[PDB]
């Protein structure tokens, strides 16, 4: 499977095992649950652009050992 690296503001680099065919929608929501917060509370940034729920690793140009950033939305979700 493809492994993406999640970079947090607390200076952390978590490994994220994603499947090339699975909608990022599922990956995003399930990761929020692992964090302990509801979805839409955090925004996933890839190359500066926010990863939409209706996106897949096939597009954008996601590769192995990639870097994905996560920040908290102003609304809080």
């Amino acid at each position: 499977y493809i492994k993406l690296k999640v970079i947090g503001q607390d200076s952390s680099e978590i490994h994220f095992k994603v499947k090339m065919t699975t909608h990022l929608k599922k990956l995003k929501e399930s990761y929020c649950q692992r964090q302990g917060v509801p979805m839409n509370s955090l925004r996933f940034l890839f190359e500066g652009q926010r990863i939409a729920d209706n996106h897949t690793p096939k597009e954008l140009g996601m590769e192995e050992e990639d870097v994905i950033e996560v920040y908290q939305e102003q609304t809080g979700g």
Binding site: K3, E13, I14, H15, T22
Partner: peptide, 14 residues
Amino acid sequence: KVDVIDLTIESSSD
């Protein structure tokens, strides 16, 4: 090593 978030549709772990 850092833990890898297993969310790949393969094993029932969701």
